[PDB]
Symmetry: D2
Subunit: 387 residues, 4 copies
C-alpha cells in the first residue's frame, strides 16, 4: 500500500524534522541559509528560490495530484501568471474558456493586448468551438472545470486528447474541486493549478497558488521561472495552508453533505428559476461530473424569480451566508458575480459566458445543514414578499 | 432561532471586525491599547488582563459549554492552576480522582505538600469512596471523565448533586471529549476546563488551556486571578486555536468513524488481552457514556499479550502512529503512559490507578481507516512473532 | 575570547539550525516531539516542559545576565508567580519593596491574605527599614531597581550581602533597564527576572516573562515548577521576543539620547515641579545609578504645576506620546499611574510609596528628539494656559 | 513641523486601529472582506487587490521615499517584474546597468530573449555609454546605485535629467541604502523600488519587495498590474516587515559606525589589494555619494592578495560573518558573488561588470565593532599564512 489521499494530506510534514523530531513541521521563515564552508551550497540557499516549509506544501500537492513536483506562488493569479511566462512567448496562441474566472479573463486580455501571445476564447463544452480553436495550432489550452460561476463541466479526456493530437500542452484550473475530488493529471494534462486560497487552505486567511506539472522537466522550468520572476510565496502562508490541507478530507465530507441538501431545497422551489450544481441529475454535465469527479463539490449558483428587488431582499437578512468574494472556506459565503467576482469582465464577455445580472453564487460551508436551510428558506420568503 | 454548537464554532468571530469587515478575525498581538483621552479606558487596556483575539476564543468555548464566560490560559496545567488559586486557600479540602492525568496528580501532590490545601484522592466511580470524601466537607471536587488513560467514566449528575448537597463546587476536566461531545455544565457543574492543546486546537501546534464558569460572579473571579497570577495565553495561540475550533465537529466525525473500526479490530484479537474504550458494551461505563456523551470519542488504551518484548515489537515499525505524548490531533499518536504521560506519578499512584507497565494509549486521528488498520495489523503480527 | 553581550544578543540562534542551515532560527510551534523508538526520549518531548524556540530565548537571556539558565513565562507577573511557588511555602517570610509595580503589590497582597507566606513591605533604600526586615529571618528578598514609577534606586551590593548574612535568597526585577544596562547577578543575586513585554521585546506585540538563576540547581527547580504549574510561554512569542532582543543595544542608544534631551527640557521648566530621572545629579540615587548601571535608561516621571486641569490639558493633544500602559517599546508612551499602572494598589499603599495623583510617567521611544521635544513643549503651554 | 524620517518609520501604524485602539497594528490575514449589504464594497474587498496591513507598509515606504503610494510584492524580483509589466510592451527598449544584481540581469536577459522588450545594457557611470543608450529612445531606464557588489555610484541628477530630455521613465533600485539614506524621487525618478528582504525588514526572515511611484496615476497602474498578475505580498510578511522598519534608523546608526571601522582596517592592510566602499575618500564616486546619500551604508566588497587559497583560508574560520546570500540584516554576512549572488550571470557578463572570481562582499551587521574587527583580523592572518 501507498497511503490514500486523506492519509497523505493529514500526514504532510508530520514527523519530518531532523533537528528535534517535532511532530508538527517547523516554520522556516529564514530568507537565507548558510553555505557548508566555501563553495558548498546546502539543499537550500535562498527562500525566493527554495524553502523547506514551502516545499512541504509543494510535495503534498504533487503527491495528491500525481505530479512530479509543485511550485507554490503568492497568489492563484500568480500561478496562472507563472504558467503563461514559463510556456508561452510572442507568436504562440493560447486557447482559454469563454466562462473562466473574471480575473483570468482580465489577465488573458491584458497580456494579449500587449502582444505576449495571441488569444482564442472558445466554448470547450462544445466540440465545434474546440475544433475551430485547435485548427490554429495553439501552444497551450487552459480548462477550468467546473467553471466559475455557472459550474459548466468540460470533458477532460475529450479536450486533452484533442489538444495532444495538435501538439498543444494542457493546463487545468482545479480550484473549484481540489485534488481530493478531481485529478486532471490522471486524464493526461501537463499541468494542474490551484488557488490555495480556496478549499486547500480552507480558512479564508491565506492567498496562495500552486502549479503541479506531470513531467519532471516542466516542473524544473516552473521552479526556474518562479525564482526569476519572484512569484514564490511566503513560508508562513505555506505553514497555514499545510495546516488547512490536513482537514481537507474531513471538511469536504461536510461541504458535500450540506451542498446536496441545499441543492434539493433550491431545485424545483417556486422562487428559483434555475439552479446550477453538477450533482443535480438535470444539470448538463451531470453524467460527465459523476465519471470524472469523486464528488459534486459544494459550489453552486442559482437565479431567483422577481428581478433586482428579489435579489436585494434575499441577500439582506442572510445570517449565515456572508456577502463577500472568495469561496472554499469553512464559513458559508454568497456572491453577486456581475458586480463582485466577475466585475473585471466587460458586460459583453459576461453576456457571452451566460452570467446574468440576477445570478447568485453560494460557497457552502461546514455549518449545520439545518441552520443553512432555515437561512435560505427565510431568504426565499423575503424574495416572494417582493412579487 | 439560535444556531447549533457546530454553526457557532464554525462562525466564531466571522464578520466581527468593525475596522474593515474582515471575514476572518484580525490577530491583535498588541500588548497595550490607547486610552480615549485622560481617564477614558477603552474596552481593553492591557493584554495580560484582556485581549480581543483571546476573548473570541473565550466567548466561543463559553457558548459551546453553556457558561457565562471563558478564560484562556498559556497551558492546560495553567487552567487547573488558575482554578486551585481562585477557589482554594489553606484549610480548604480538594477531592480529586485517583486516575486523573499524571500532571494533575503532580500539581495536586506538590501544592498539598506545601499546605495550600488538604488533598483527598478518591475513586469517584465507586459510591463508598465518594461518600467518605464528601463527608470531610470539601470546598472543591474535580472530576476527569473519561479518565486518562483508562477511560473510566464518572457519573456527572450523581457526583455533582452529591457535591452540591454538602456545599462543594465541582470542576470537570473535559479535555478527552471537548465541548462537541460532553457538556458538564448541563448537569449542574460550576466549572469546566480543557487543555485546548488537544481536540479544540486539533493541529498539535499550540499548548493552551480554557476555564468556563456557569456563573458570571465566578467568571469575574477567574478573570481577576488570571491577570494577577499572569496565567493568560498569547493572542497568536488564541488565533490558531480558534482556527482549529472551526473544524472540531468535522474532525470528530472522522475520529469516531476510525475509533469504532479500530476498537472492533482490537477487541477479541488473539494478541490483545484488554481494550479500554467506552464504545465497547463490555466496558464498565459504556451505558453511562452513551447517556452523558454525544459520542464515545477517539481515545483508547489496550494491553498486549507477551510482556515488554511484545510492546517493543508492536511500537517499533508503526508508520502512521507516531510515538509521542499529547492527543486530540489530526495525526494518529501512540503513548506508553508509565514511561511517558504518567511518568510524573509514583509507581504506587500508577498501581492504585490501575495503570500497568504494559498499557499502550492510542490517539486516533483522521487518516483513512484502512491505512490505520493495516498499520495496527502489522504491529499485532510483530507482537505475535515475539512469543 | 568570548564575544560581547551585544554580539551575543544580535546572534542568538543565528546559523544554529541542523536541519537546513537556516540563518534565522525556525519557529517550532509543535506541542509534541516523537520518541526515537520505544523508551528513547529525544532532547524535547512536550512544549509545556521544554521547546527549542523558547530555549533560544532562555539561553540568550541567561548569557546576557550571567546565569546558569532561563525560564520563559507567558507574562511578567507569571515569572514573579513562578519564583514565589518555587521558593516559598506557608511559614516562610518574603520582603518586598514599598514602591514595587502595583501589579506586584496586587499579587504579594492577595497570596499573603490567603497565607501562602508572610509579607514584610520595607523601604529597601533606607537601612533601618531593611535591617528590621532582615532581623525577621526571610526566605526571600525582592528588589525592583530602578522602581516603577518614581525611579528610586536600591543598592544591589548592600542589600544582597545583607540578605546573604541572614540566609535569605535575593531576586531582582530588572525590567526597567534590561540586561544591557544592569546585571544584578554580577553583585551576587540568586535570581533576576523580567517582563519581556518591555525593552527586551521592544515592539509592544508580546506579553512575556523571564527568570534567570545564577545556580544550576535553582534553574532546574524553576524548570520543574514552570512545567508543573503550566506557566511556560508560547514558542511564537519567544520567536518575536528573540527577534526583538537583536535590536536591544541599538534601540537603547537612541532611547538614552532621547531621554537625556527630555530630562534637560523638563528639569527647572517653570511648569514642572519635580522630575524623577536617575540621570539628573539632583535625583536621590543618581551616584548609585551611575555605579550599578551602564546607563540611566529612558523611563522618567514628573509632577506638573496646576493640578488636575493642567495634567488633562498636557495629555489631551500629545501627537507622539500615546496614552497607554506598558513601557520599553520603540514608540513613546505616557501614563498616569494612580488611575492606570498602579490602580491595583489602595490609595494608602500609593501614599506610602509617594505616588501622588498628579504624577505622569514617560516611556521615551526612539523617535527623533526634535519631534518628541516639540510635542512636550506644546503640552507644557497647554498646561501653562490652565493657570 | 511634519515629522522626520525616523519618527515616520517608528510610528508607522501606531495607534491606527479603530476597533480596539491597539497600539501595535492588528494582522489582517483575511483573504476576503464583507460587503456593507448588496451593491456596497467597503474600502477593502479581497487581499490580492488590497489589504490594510500591507497598506500600512506601502503607506510608510511612500512617506519615507516622498511618493504618491506604495505597492508591496512577494519578492524584490517581483517588484522589478511588476515595473517591467506595467510600463513596457514589445517594441519598447529598456536600458539597464552592466553591473546590476545578477538576479535582475537573469530576468532582463530571459524576458528580452522572448521579445517582451529590447534590452540595452550600458555603463551609466560613463557619459558616452549613457548617451549612446539614450540615442535609442528607450521607454525606461533602470539605475541600481550603489551597485551590487562593486558599490559603483551613479549620478542620479545627471542620468535622470538626461533620460527626461529623451522622454524615458526612470526607475531606481534603492535596496542597498534604503529610504533612510537615499531618496531617488527627490532627484526626479518616476519610480523607486526595494527588496524589503534587506535593510527595511532587517531581520532576515521575510522575502519582500516594494515599488513607490512619484505620480498618483502611475501608482494606480502599479496597483492594477499587481492585482492582475497576483504579485502582491502576504499580510503576515508585511506585519514583520513593518515591525523591522521601526528599528531602521537605530539599526543604520550601528551598521554605519561598524562599516566605517571595517573600511579603515581593510584600506591599505598589506593583505588587501582593493576595497570598494563609497565612504573611503579614494573610491571613485565618493564625492557624489557624500552629496546624493545621507550616509555611506554598510555594504562593501574587497579583493585579497594570494588567489583562491587566501579566499578559502579567510572565509573558513569566520565566527561572526555567516557565509550566505542576502544582506541588510542585523547579523553580519559574507558572500562570494561569482559562485553565489551573481552565479545566475554568464562569466562574460561578470567580466563586463568587473566582478572578479576573488571578490568577497561584506554585509556589516550591528554586532560590537570590536568583535567584527577581531574576526576580520584573524581572517587576514589566515590568508597571510597561505603565502609562506
Ligand atoms: C477558478 C479560479 N482560479 C483562480 C483564481 C485566482 O486565485 P487568487 O489569486 O484569488 O488566489 C480564482 C479566484 N476566485 C475568487 C476571486 C475573488 S474576485 C477578485 C478581486 N476583487 C479582483 O479584482 O481580482 C472568487 O471567484 O470568489 C478562481 O475562482
Ligand atoms: C486530561 C488532561 N488535563 C490536562 C492536561 C494538561 O494540559 P496541557 O498543559 O498539556 O495543555 C493534559 C495533558 N495530557 C497530555 C500530555 C502528557 S505530557 C508529559 C510532560 N512530559 C509533562 O511533564 O507534563 C497527555 O496525556 O498526552 C490532560 O490529558
Ligand atoms: C517592573 C515590572 N515588573 C513586572 C511587570 C509585569 O510584567 P507583565 O506581566 O505585564 O509582562 C511590570 C508591568 N508593568 C506595566 C503594566 C501596567 S498594566 C495594568 C493592568 N491593567 C493590570 O491589571 O495588570 C507598566 O507599569 O506599564 C513591571 O513594570
Ligand atoms: C539590488 C537588489 N535588487 C533586488 C534584489 C532582489 O530582491 P529579492 O527578490 O531577493 O527580495 C536583490 C537581491 N540580492 C540578494 C540576492 C541573493 S542571490 C539569490 C538566489 N540564489 C537566486 O538564484 O536568485 C543578494 O545580493 O545577496 C538585490 O541585491
Amino acid at each position: 500500500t501507498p497511503c490514500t489521499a486523506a492519509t497523505a494530506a493529514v500526514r504532510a510534514g508530520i514527523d519530518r524534522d531532523t533537528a528535534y523530531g517535532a511532530v508538527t513541521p517547523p516554520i522556516v521563515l529564514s530568507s537565507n541559509f548558510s553555505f557548508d564552508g566555501f563553495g558548498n551550497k546546502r539543499q537550500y540557499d535562498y527562500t525566493r528560490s527554495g524553502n523547506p516549509t514551502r516545499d512541504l506544501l509543494g510535495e503534498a500537492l504533487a503527491e495528491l495530484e500525481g505530479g512530479a513536483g509543485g511550485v507554490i506562488t503568492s497568489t492563484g493569479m500568480g500561478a496562472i501568471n507563472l504558467v503563461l511566462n514559463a510556456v508561452l512567448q510572442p507568436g504562440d496562441t493560447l486557447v482559454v474558456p469563454h466562462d473562466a474566472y473574471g480575473g483570468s479573463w482580465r489577465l488573458f486580455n491584458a497580456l494579449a493586448k500587449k502582444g505576449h501571445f495571441a488569444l482564442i476564447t472558445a466554448d470547450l463544452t462544445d466540440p465545434r468551438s474546440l475544433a475551430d480553436a485547435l485548427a490554429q495550432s495553439p501552444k497551450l489550452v487552459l480548462i477550468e472545470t467546473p467553471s466559475n460561476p455557472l459550474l459548466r463541466i468540460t470533458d477532460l479526456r475529450f479536450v486533452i486528447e484533442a489538444a495532444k493530437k495538435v501538439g498543444a500542452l494542457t493546463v487545468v484550473d482545479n480550484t473549484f474541486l481540489s485534488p481530493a475530488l478531481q485529478k486532471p493529471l490522471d486524464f493526461g494534462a501537463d499541468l494542474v493549478l490551484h488557488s490555495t486560497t480556496k478549499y486547500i487552505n480552507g480558512h479564508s486567511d491565506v492567498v496562495g497558488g500552486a502549479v503541479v506539472a506531470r513531467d519532471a522537466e516542466l516542473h524544473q522550468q516552473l521552479v526556474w521561472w518562479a525564482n526569476a520572476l519572484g512569484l514564490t510565496g511566503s513560508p508562513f502562508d505555506a505553514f497555514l495552508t499545510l495546516r488547512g490541507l490536513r482537514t481537507l478530507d474531513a471538511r469536504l465530507r461536510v461541504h458535500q453533505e450540506n451542498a446536496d441538501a441545499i441543492a434539493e431545497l433550491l431545485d424545483g422551489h417556486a422562487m428559483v428559476n434555475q439552479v446550477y450544481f453538477p450533482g443535480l441529475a438535470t444539470h448538463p454535465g451531470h453524467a460527465l461530473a459523476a465519471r470524472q469527479q469523486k464528488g459534486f463539490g459544494a459550489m453552486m449558483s442559482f437565479e431567483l424569480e422577481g428581478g433586482e428587488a428579489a435579489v436585494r431582499a434575499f441577500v439582506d437578512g442572510l445570517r449565515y451566508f456572508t456577502l463577500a468574494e472568495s469561496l472554499g472556506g469553512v464559513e458559508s459565503l454568497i456572491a453577486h458575480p456581475a458586480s463582485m467576482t466577475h466585475a473585471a469582465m466587460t458586460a459583453e464577455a459576461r453576456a457571452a459566458a451566460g452570467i446574468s445580472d440576477g445570478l447568485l453564487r453560494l460557497s457552502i460551508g461546514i455549518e449545520s445543514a439545518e441552520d443553512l436551510l432555515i437561512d435560505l428558506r427565510a431568504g426565499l420568503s423575503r424574495a416572494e414578499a417582493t412579487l
